[PDB]
Design a protein around this ligand. Sequence first.
Ligand code: 6H3
Ligand code: CL
Length: 347
Amino acid sequence: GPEMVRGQVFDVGPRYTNLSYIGEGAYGMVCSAYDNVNKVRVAIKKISPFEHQTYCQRTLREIKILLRFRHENIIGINDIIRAPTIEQMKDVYIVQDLMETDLYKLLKTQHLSNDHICYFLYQILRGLKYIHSANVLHRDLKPSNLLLNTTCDLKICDFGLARVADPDHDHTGFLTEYVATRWYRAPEIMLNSKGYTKSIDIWSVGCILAEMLSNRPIFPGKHYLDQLNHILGILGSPSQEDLNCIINLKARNYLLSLPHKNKVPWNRLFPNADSKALDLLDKMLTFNPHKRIEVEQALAHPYLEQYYDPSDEPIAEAPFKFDMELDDLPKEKLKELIFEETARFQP
Ligand SMILES: *CCC(=O)Nc1ccccc1Nc1nc(Nc2ccc(N3CCN(C)CC3)cc2)ncc1Cl
Ligand SMILES: [Cl-]
């Protein structure tokens, strides 16, 4: 019999055995397993994407990116199990390093010391430096996408929404749809942006920093436009200069339709926080994406001075590229690319 976990097939033997359910991830069931080759427990997530084009797109994005990335602060893919033949292939099993928890869970239970916050933020930005050096955007950074171990080591995961950066094609309408998690969206997303620039990830990191400082999401919008109102509830109404940068006619009109809001000083929002952390937070949560701090500058910020060290901050060999643009491909074609991409792990 293939191994079973809570009524579900988990066909990862004989190599991986001694399974334990650990949770539901974004794609399906995840277990811990004993790897009989490397003599260690690992994480295995069961993906069943093939009925839907979007699940197929995200699965392929994640696999292609994570096979190509290698970095301490980024989750790997160690092994992939799928069927010998494509018709047989209904599930893909992605094997990853087993971690202890994620930041989302840690923040439910623990107030973090300034030291831990500083180190966590370093690691996020260290990993993001590498991602960005490959001209890749994560586009869904949030606490639950940051895995942690007992040692405070941090790995960014869940690259299903990643894209190659494309600042030339960033511009789009007002009210455009967006996939990434609401609370971590930059203001421009709700205004003129498709999220194809690096500044999109920096915003999300700033939201995570705020959350590490207080154990509350800084901008817990309930709906699309509400999110932006929460943002402006802290940043205040945008400056003249920043209004003038938005090209969408609709967007700046929408902004002018809103009631004026007073900027809430960071001092006041986080009274016990390190002033250096707040200065960096300010620079990450800047309304105008052009003026927003970049990953290398954030790393070089005084707050992270005990860690910043380019000699210990690897970068990618060269820019990433999709071989095919994945969004005009039907699911049967995406299933074939997934088959191909996973063949290097077949006996
Ligand atoms: C990267 C995002 C992701 O894959 N997150 C996720 C979500 C649910 C379950 C697993 C999982 N991925 C990984 N988890 C671990 N380790 C791990 C997760 C959850 C726990 N919990 C212990 C307490 N409760 C029983 C709930 C589960 C423990 C350890 N490691 C690697 C990955 Cl990829
Ligand atoms: Cl809305």
